[model samples]
Target chain A: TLEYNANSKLITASDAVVALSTETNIDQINVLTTSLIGETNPNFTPQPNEALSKMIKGLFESGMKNLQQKKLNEALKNVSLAIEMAQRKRAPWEAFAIQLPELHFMLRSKIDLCLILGKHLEALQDLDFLLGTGLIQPDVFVRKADCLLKLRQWEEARATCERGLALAPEDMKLRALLIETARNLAEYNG
Target chain B: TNYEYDEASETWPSFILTGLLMVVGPMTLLQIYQFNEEVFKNLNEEYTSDEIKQFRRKFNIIIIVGWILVAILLQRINSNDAQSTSHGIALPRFLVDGSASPLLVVCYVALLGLILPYFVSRWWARTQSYTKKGIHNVTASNFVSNLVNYKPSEIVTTDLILHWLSFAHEFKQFFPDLQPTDFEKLLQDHINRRDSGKLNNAKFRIVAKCHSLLHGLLDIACGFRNLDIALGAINTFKCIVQAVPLTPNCQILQLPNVDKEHFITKTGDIHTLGKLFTLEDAKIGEVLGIKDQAKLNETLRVASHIPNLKIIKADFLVPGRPYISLKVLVRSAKQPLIPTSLIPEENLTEPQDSESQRDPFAMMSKQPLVPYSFAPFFPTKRRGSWCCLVSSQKDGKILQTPIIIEKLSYKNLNDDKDFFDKRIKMDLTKHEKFDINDWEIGTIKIPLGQPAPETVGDFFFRVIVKSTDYFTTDLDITMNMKVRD
Candidate 1:
């Protein structure tokens, strides 16, 4: 039943590595006329630790299998572990350079499992983490507001709904949630 | 051989013989109940009409009671035999003696009561000849009546246009090869049969289209997660199953033996089922004169199963904008389990019937999905549309154009958790902008007449949702609103 299109070739460090400096500052080269402070590889790409990369990949695939078999707890544990491994490094940017999309994928999967398990507080934390990293989308607002709604944080839910409404004016679910949150807020005042 | 013969006679004297009869008694009762269930199972699947199904349910209980009585009698027979044997009498005897206890006599008579139906059915079966031609006639008359009965007015309104559009859309989707000409030809035939009592080849097309439209509306509801659409589908399906038009008169017609001859004249001003509910049980009892209390109880039971529409909230979303929002619920008399026969074919593709090409309507008609009236004597085709109207209560003038409920009822109301919870918004300015001064007291109503209801206060919107045809299925909710600009 699982018709998966897996990677045909083995993934290498370079395959995961994205090019960094597509838009380098041309002013820096012209700044030879001014005070030249240092010469550096502006396009320097980070090479991930080989074992850590393999370990994270293994954990992610294991999580996928666990999810396929509906072993939610096992899947959540593996995914959370994978996310932790991906987030490991000095700077968040460096972690982003090494992992980037894999981290995002694992985070989303973890958040999904958290929501399913009714750990709304934990889901909200992951959603905030997503929003913190500027991974903003209409769905992020909807889910964040949904989490707040479940937690009975009416004001926060209302704000989230409003924000999502700005992005997608015609979204029925968001509008419904907005109306619901408004009703709760109105009742609270009464 | 001589040794086996000696053992057989010895075996009867052992306790095993007594134990076997004890085991056999319970098993026989259970077996007979199961056998009765099996016999009626096919009838439930085929007839599927409410009365047939209801009769089966009642009949099954009676038979079950009968079987239990027989089992008890067998136990008593054995005990009676034991009493005689204690007096040194050797053989078992069935007690028909004058000294038999009153309880034993009652059990005997009850067993005979069960046996009486067998004789009744035998005589009835002999008298009734359901030959091939007669069966065809019965089904054909049902089919023709479905085409003509509850015929909509020739006057085309917004609701009629929308309904025809929905039907046509479904018709084209299901029968792509068939053109508008072919479609009109069917409609033309329907119109022609109205004058001359002639049948046409394309008569089933109208029924087929209506049937296909019901499925399509439900598909829209399921696929798009639209409850308004789902509700409409349910309403349409209800009309089809119960074979009653979406009219107020049809409400009282839904009850068994409450034909127009008696019920029409007796219940003065009691046009709708909702009004009927206002009366006391004693009043209802006197009104129907239904001597059979069980029949009245069944009618009351059926009234619950009928979809009852209740308005939860109605408000102007924004003051002076001519935009009105309404939240309503349609509740059935009894919460029902999904019928086994009407369970959806989840697998998209099905084994093709050989005759499907020649007659797709008959072939494609899933039992219980096709419109068949169950009003015993009254012939109703079942699939009819109801349109909601916002009208001025004082002047009896339309405030807004009709909002056609393309599918008013859910096929199975329980299919969606929120099927009953609906919020419908009406924009009065959609068709024509009305003067701000014209806004007075308004009532949202489903028209009871072929023409809109003439009187404002007496508009009784009857909503029925019954799986089988029998009993007045009327839903209730009437509200009057005042608006000032």
Candidate 2:
């Protein structure tokens, strides 16, 4: 279904790659990424490192699959490694992303995985790394409060919720988490 | 979108031109032949002997009212406009800022004076024509006939070229050689009436252009907001009088946001806020009037260190009804609220008729709480200032943060679903030094027991707060959001 040339990084689409190209769900594509890595459908073959590019592509798609399926544990593992592998073989991961970035999702998915999997301090290190670059997401703030609340640093949630409140003025759903984080924080103060 | 009021973008032009245009309107109506000229045969076709007396009573007041409504709309228009990157260079400064100029104010008054007659004439023509034919002759010429029957204003303030392209569609048999314009597609959709979506989209765009003039220019200069609203009201009023619906731009001017960007209220009115209180608090029970105060005994004051709880009221001009933004912020509370009830008590006599609960207009703050929620995006490395819950994934040994996943409500899923997904950036610092007050679980959600980590693991999350100067002891948690619990 898919095709590749041994040395050429450019791969051609067929019934396989054509179908996968439109695929947004990562897990479904990851399955195909494995068996279809270098296999082309009577169209072409891949170059040495070119095949490695295909393999890395497979790795990245697997991250999507895990993230979507709510398997943050596995998603964090595969998504990060895929980028590291792609850059080594001169594949266009970062550059391609500037146009239609899929890597950022993998990046955020890891933080959720860390946040959910029991590394409070470790999660902030990753979170700080993002804030370091001067980027903020609404939920990222909520997550920060969550982290503080989880660490039993209750008062901190208030500061984070205020940050979130400034972005959005009169919304209650967001306040719940801030309120939720505060509930713990409040309990501490209480 | 904070708005700036100035001079260059002043809309005195809209006020003056529209007024002068209306004076010219009835004068030209007599020659059109198809126009109902006989309707204008009173002392003067536009104003009468008593209108000067009536003018003192009606004319001046209408203009003043127009000033308030028009300025509110025009001021906010360019602020939220996606196209205008430069709001500064446009519009002249008004002494210190805000309110129209004296001459411009006079122009608006003069303009409303003209608009009143213009709409009166249009209605005169619209009504007389309706009776003259019972309906239009439905001919190709009649279609192009400058008769006031068809809404000619539809294309006037909008994209004229695009409108004319589609306007040609009605006479397609005559203009068969021409292609239908993009808007004609919606015009035709109305004829076919299969898809409501196209009608919605078309109406949306039609109302959108109502926000600015010549796309944020001349209107900014002349200030026709008052005139625009008046005309829309007149159009809708006339059509309603005749028992019909006319397409008019439905606009509401609220602050800090607009639709789509922030989820608007169902009434598209104010979102109220109430301070949180516990189920216990015997004295608190007397204030809310829960006949059985003992039922609430288990609850806390929740309002600790939280004093001066009162309503913060500001008049936000939106025509026809009340124009105000009301919230509870004696000290700055966007939404302070308690639940329907933490635990049930026969839907208990909840302060029924007490504190005028049965009365009107007291929903300033101590009512249903409105959460100030939005997904604020800032591209920076993690800082305490980000003030929000953040999630991330590994980025090649490092990390990247995006695709945030927020949690469920104090209640379970489907309990209070609308608010479940709203997320906001959060910061905890000086604003967060006070004691925590967990909301009573009034926003109820269903409990499906506990599910697998692969399923509901994200629901029960742990947080870590980074502090540079502070060190914390262990924490407490007897009653939490019950996010999982």
**Estimated TM-score for each candidate:** 0.24, 0.22
Q: What DockQ values do the models have?
A: 0.01, 0.02
True contacts kept of each: 0.00, 0.00
Q: What is the interface RMSD of each candidate, in Å?
A: 19.3, 12.0
Kindly report the interface RMSD of candidate 2, rounded to 1 decimal: 12.0
lDDT of 2 by residue, B380-473 (tens): 1111110011111211010111111112121111122222111221432123332223222221111112232333212222111111101112
Best by lDDT: 1
Docking class of 2: incorrect
lDDT of 2 at A140: 74
List A-chain TM-scores for all predictions: 0.68, 0.54
Candidate 2 positional error at A64, Å: 4.6
**Chain B TM-score for candidate 1:** 0.30
Q: Which ten residues in a row have the lowest lDDT in candidate 1 chain B?
A: B35-44
